[PDB]
């Protein structure tokens, strides 16, 4: 009769309707869900950690069993620290599927307790790629269809300065 806690890591740069769907799904089936934002020190994300967490909070705060936290280092260690039952990943048609198996199996070798549990998002979200979203925004196009309003405004606000 133990509580479920799943960790959903990613860069969420920025969060998309697809990510929202997934979290919504996950919130319905796990007791607690942690939206885990990888800082990306060596990665160089467009949006800052604060901006990413803010935007996630805005699109998913209404779910009461959803936490939001940034993290670096090893997902396996974050997993341990958070006393997590499993790491959640999404699985679309566009997904590097062998590349989920590498992640999953290598992490298992680092920690035999590590478990991974994929969910698939509503078919309308099977084709959107944050890379393309960011590119469309950059070229002053409409991303209203692919990300929450808050994110759309973030994009303007990013144009409006330079960082
Ligand atoms: C954090 C981590 C899980 C993320 O990898 P990932 O599956 O690519 O997920 P990310 O958050 O990196 O997302 C990267 C890409 O996935 C894509 N993506 C995944 N789900 C998506 C969705 N629902 N909608 C749109 N794009 C999506 C995007 O194209 C994204 O591109 P971006 O780099 O512009 O954001 C992985 O890098 C990690 O675990 N790092 C921890 C460090 C570690 O342990 N390393 C060794 C593990 S063996």
What does this molecule look like?
With 163 residues, this protein is α/β, with parallel strands linked by helices. It has a single domain, classed as HUPs (Rossmann fold, 3-Layer(aba) Sandwich), CATH 3.40.50.620. The chain is 40% helix and 13% strand. The chain contains 6 helices and 4 strands; from the N terminus they run E-H-E-H-E-H-E-H-H-H. The chain has helices spanning 17-29, 49-60, 75-81, 98-110, 130-138, 149-159, and strands at 5-10, 32-38, 66-71, 86-87. It has a 4-stranded parallel sheet with strand order 3-2-1-4, with helices on both faces. Strand 2, helix 2 (49-60) and strand 3 form a beta-alpha-beta unit. It is globular and about 50 Å long. The protein starts with a strand and ends with a helix. The chain binds coenzyme A. The site of coenzyme A has 18 residues, from strand 1, helix 1, helix 4 and helix 5.
Main attributes of the structure:
Rossmann fold, EC 2.7.7.3, 4 strands, four-stranded parallel sheet, Phosphopantetheine adenylyltransferase, alpha/beta, binds coenzyme A, 163 residues, 40% helix, 6 helices, ATP binding
Tally the helices: what do you get?
Answer: 6
Strand order of the largest sheet: 3-2-1-4
Class by alpha and beta content = alpha/beta
- The gross shape turns out to be globular
PDB class: transferase
Keywords: transferase
Assembly: monomeric
Entry title: The crystal structure of Phosphopantetheine adenylyltransferase from Acinetobacter baumannii with Coenzyme A at 2.88 A resolution
